[PDB]
From a paper:
By contrast, B13 H3 adopts a similar conformation when paired with either B13 or B4 LCs. Interface analysis of the paired variable regions of the heavy and light chains showed little difference for the B13 HC with either LC. A detailed analysis shows LC residues 47–52 in the B13* structure are less buried than those in the B13 structure. The observation that only small structural differences in the B13 HC occur on exchanging the B13 LC for the B4 LC is consistent with the very modest reduction in antigen-binding affinity measured by SPR. The transition melting temperatures (Tm) for the B4 and B13 Fabs and the hybrid B4* were within 1 °C of each other whereas the B13* showed a 5 °C +/- 1 °C increase in Tm indicating a stronger association of heavy and light chains. For the Fabs with more than one molecule in the AU superimposition showed that the 6 B13 Fabs differed by rmsds of 0.7–1.4 Å, the 2 B4* Fabs by only 0.3 Å and the 4 B13* Fabs by 0.5–2.3 Å based on Cα atoms.
We have investigated the role of the LC in the structure and activity of two neutralizing cattle antibodies (B4 and B13) that bind the F protein of bovine respiratory syncytial virus (bRSV). The F protein epitopes recognised by mAbs B4 and B13 are conserved in both human (h) and bovine (b) RSV, and are a major cause of lower respiratory tract infections in young children and calves, respectively. Both B4 and B13 are potent neutralizing, fusion-inhibiting antibodies and protect mice against hRSV infection and calves against bRSV infection. Exchanging the LCs between the Fab fragments produced hybrid Fabs: B13* (B13 HC/B4 LC) and B4* (B4 HC/B13 LC).
Residue numbers in the entry:
A (entry chain L): 3 to 213
B (entry chain H): 2 to 148, 152 to 205, 210 to 240
Write the structure that this text describes.
C-alpha cells in the first residue's frame, strides 16, 4: 500500500503539497497518478504518469517524483479544492492505490447557520407517525452541535443528526431528525432545535397545539 | 464517451455481486477497462482489469472471489464478486486503463484516462450494499415551515427507505436555484431518511420528484407553499 498523510491543511492562495511514498518496486519504477474526489461526486483524474494533466484540470495542479516518494502540489488553493486526494501506481502487472489524503482549506469567511425547523405533515400524522426535521445550512467552519428540547427539557433518544457536509456554495450543511409517535407529538406544548456553532446558538421552535 | 455502472444496489451476504459497465461512444476492442471500489470512508481498492484482447489481471487479495468478463458487441464489461460480506459494501467504479508510450522509458498506463485523447474516463460509481434487509420504498411527505417571512422555505421529506440511494429533483429538473438535498441519515428503525429543501424569495408551484431505483418507485409530490390560506 502507498502511504499518504491522512490530512493536510492550507489557506486560500497558499501552496500545499501531498506526499505519496511507496517502494523501489512501484513508485521508483513506474509512473504515479493522482485522483480527486469532492464529497458530492465520484473520482476525477487530475494528473497522470508524473506531471501531465488531463483536459480541463487547472494549471495549479502538478506532480513530481523523487526516488520512491511522489508529490502532488497545488500552487494556489481555492475553495473547490477541498476534497480527498488519492495516488496510484503499478508494481508490474498489479495496480496499488494510496490510503487517501483529506485536503482542508482554511481562511474561508465565517458564516452562522441558517436553521429551519419543519413540523410533521398532516399526511404523516395519519399514519400515527411524526418526524421533526431541523435543516441547517450556510455555516463555516463545517461543525455544529444540535440539541433538541421539548418544554425546555433536553431529549437524547430517537434523535439522529447527520454530520456536516459540503454544499454548493462551499460552506457546510447538516440535518437533524426527531422521530416520535403522533400521540407523543401532541403530548407536549412546544419542541425546539438548538444549533450551536462557534460559541453561538441559533434556536427555532415549533408548537403542535398552535401551529 | 461515457462509462455507466449498473446492477443491484442491494445484495444478500454470501451471494454474488454482479455489475455491468456499459461503455458508450467507444469500442471495447481497443480499450482496457478495469474496476475500482471505495468502501464507506476507506481508501480506493483496485479489483481488476480486462485488457483489449481479453487478458485479465486481478487483485491478489480478491482473486479467488473475482471474475471479470466482457462482450465487445454489447459494449459491456462484467464484474462478479462471490461470497460477499459487509466488508464488500462499497461504491464500485469502472474506468478505462489508458496506456501511452513514454519516449525515454517505455509503456505505462493510467486508470481513468483514455489512451489517445487523454480525457477523463471514470464511471459515475454505483453504491451497492451487502445487507440482509429487504427493499423498502420511501414514503415522501411535504415540508412546510408555516407552523409570513420574506423567503418562504419548503421541502420534501423522503422517509424510511432501504437501500441507498434516492435522487431528488424539483419540477422535472427545471428548478435548481436555491435547492439543497441533504445526505441521508440512518435511524433506529434501520431505514434511511433524507430531506430536500427549497429557499425561494411566490408565484409558482413546487413539486419534488423522488426516485428510488432499488424499489423501481418514482413519486412526484406537490408541496403547498401557501400558509394563511390553507390553514384559514
Amino acid at each position: 500500500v502507498l502511504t499518504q498523510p491522512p490530512s493536510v491543511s492550507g489557506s486560500l492562495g497558499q501552496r500545499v503539497s501531498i506526499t505519496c511514498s511507496g517502494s523501489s518496486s512501484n513508485i521508483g519504477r513506474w509512473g504515479v497518478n493522482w485522483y480527486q474526489q469532492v464529497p458530492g461526486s465520484g473520482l476525477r483524474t487530475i494528473i497522470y504518469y508524473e506531471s501531465s494533466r488531463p483536459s480541463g484540470v487547472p494549471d495549479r495542479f502538478s506532480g513530481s517524483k523523487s526516488g520512491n516518494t511522489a508529490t502532488l502540489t497545488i500552487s494556489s488553493l481555492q475553495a473547490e479544492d477541498e476534497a480527498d486526494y488519492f495516488c496510484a501506481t503499478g508494481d508490474y502487472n498489479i495496480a496499488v492505490f494510496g490510503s487517501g489524503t483529506t485536503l482542508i482549506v482554511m481562511g474561508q469567511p465565517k458564516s452562522p447557520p441558517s436553521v429551519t425547523l419543519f413540523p410533521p405533515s398532516t399526511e404523516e400524522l395519519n399514519g400515527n407517525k411524526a418526524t421533526l426535521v431541523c435543516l441547517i445550512s450556510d455555516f463555516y467552519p463545517g461543525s455544529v452541535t444540535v440539541v433538541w428540547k421539548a418544554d425546555g427539557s433536553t431529549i437524547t433518544r430517537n434523535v439522529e443528526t447527520t454530520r456536516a457536509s459540503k454544499q454548493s456554495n462551499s460552506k457546510y450543511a447538516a440535518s437533524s431528525y426527531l422521530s416520535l409517535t403522533s400521540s407523543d407529538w401532541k403530548s407536549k406544548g412546544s419542541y425546539s432545535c438548538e444549533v450551536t456553532h462557534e460559541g453561538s446558538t441559533v434556536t427555532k421552535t415549533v408548537k403542535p397545539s398552535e401551529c | 464517451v461515457q462509462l455507466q455502472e449498473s446492477g443491484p444496489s442491494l445484495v444478500k451476504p454470501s451471494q454474488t455481486l454482479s455489475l455491468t459497465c456499459t461503455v458508450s461512444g467507444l469500442s471495447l476492442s481497443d480499450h482496457n477497462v478495469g474496476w475500482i471500489r471505495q468502501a464507506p470512508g476507506k481508501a480506493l481498492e483496485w479489483l481488476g482489469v480486462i485488457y483489449k484482447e481479453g487478458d485479465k489481471d486481478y487483485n491478489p487479495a480478491l482473486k479467488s472471489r473475482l471474475s471479470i468478463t466482457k462482450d465487445n458487441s454489447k459494449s459491456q464489461v462484467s464484474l462478479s464478486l462471490s461470497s460477499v460480506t459487509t466488508e464488500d459494501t462499497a461504491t464500485y467504479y469502472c474506468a478505462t486503463l489508458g496506456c501511452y508510450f513514454v519516449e525515454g522509458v517505455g509503456y505505462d498506463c493510467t486508470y481513468g484516462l483514455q489512451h489517445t485523447t487523454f480525457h477523463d474516463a471514470w464511471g459515475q460509481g454505483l453504491l451497492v450494499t451487502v445487507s440482509s434487509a429487504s427493499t423498502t420504498a420511501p414514503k415522501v411527505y411535504p415540508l412546510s415551515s408555516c407552523c409570513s417571512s420574506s423567503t418562504v422555505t419548503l421541502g420534501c421529506l423522503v422517509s424510511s427507505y432501504m437501500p441507498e440511494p434516492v435522487t431528488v429533483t424539483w419540477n422535472s429538473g427545471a428548478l435548481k436555484s436555491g435547492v439543497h438535498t441533504f445526505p441521508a441519515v440512518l435511524q433506529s428503525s434501520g431505514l434511511y431518511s433524507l430531506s430536500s429543501m427549497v429557499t425561494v424569495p411566490g408565484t409558482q408551484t413546487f413539486t419534488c420528484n423522488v426516485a428510488h431505483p432499488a424499489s423501481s418507485t418514482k413519486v412526484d409530490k406537490a408541496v403547498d407553499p401557501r400558509c394563511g390560506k390553507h390553514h384559514h
